[PDB]
């Protein structure tokens, strides 16, 4: 058996074909087992509609998840990603920094 804690990165991207649009991303990488719970949060509340959830694996024991959706960050509100995994005794919340 192997278990590996996810690395979690939270960032924003504009798709080059539609640069006025902005996407909030949570990239959860290198984890095992694959069982996981991932949410995007706005003011601590689960964003119910997340458009994209892309899961892959490299080696049989390393999984990668890109979880992302369109958003409009203003100076109002706080955004984050929350991850639950067997390796994490408490949920891990990683805040989005507007500079990322």
Author numbering: 0 to 99
Please quote the paper that reports this structure.
Here, we report the use of the TPBLA to explore the role of the protein sequence in determining the aggregation of the naturally amyloidogenic protein, β2m. The protein forms the noncovalently bound light chain of the major histocompatibility complex class 1 (MHC 1) and is important for antigen presentation. More recently, two single-point variants of this protein, D76N and V27M, have been identified in amyloid deposits in the viscera or tongue, respectively, with the former occurring in the absence of kidney disease.
To examine the structural effect of other amino acid substitutions at this site, the crystal structures of seven variants (D76E-, D76A-, D76S-, D76G-, D76Q-, D76Y-, and D76K-β2m) were determined at high resolution (1.15 to 1.52 Å). For other variants, the loop structure is maintained despite these hydrogen bonds either not forming (D76A-, D76G-, and D76Y-β2m), or being reduced in number (D76K-β2m hydrogen bonds to N42, and D76S-β2m hydrogen bonds to N42 and T73). A second group of residues, with a significantly reduced score compared to Asp76, includes the D76E- and D76A-β2m variants (∼ 400 AUC [P = 0.01 compared with WT-β2m]), while a third group contains the remaining 17 D76X-β2m variants, which have significantly decreased scores (P = 0.003 compared with D76E/A-β2m). Overall, the results show that the presence of a negatively charged Asp protects β2m from aggregation, at least as judged by the TPBLA, with the negatively charged D76E-β2m or neutral D76A-β2m providing some, albeit more limited, protection as judged by this assay. The native Asp was most protective, Glu and Ala showed some protection, and all other residues (including Asn) resulted in a low in vivo growth score when introduced at this site. Six substitutions are observed at residue 76 (Ala, His, Asn, Ser, Thr, and Val). Interestingly, saturation mutagenesis of residue 76 showed that these six substitutions are among those that have the least effect on the in vivo growth score and on protein stability compared with Asp76.
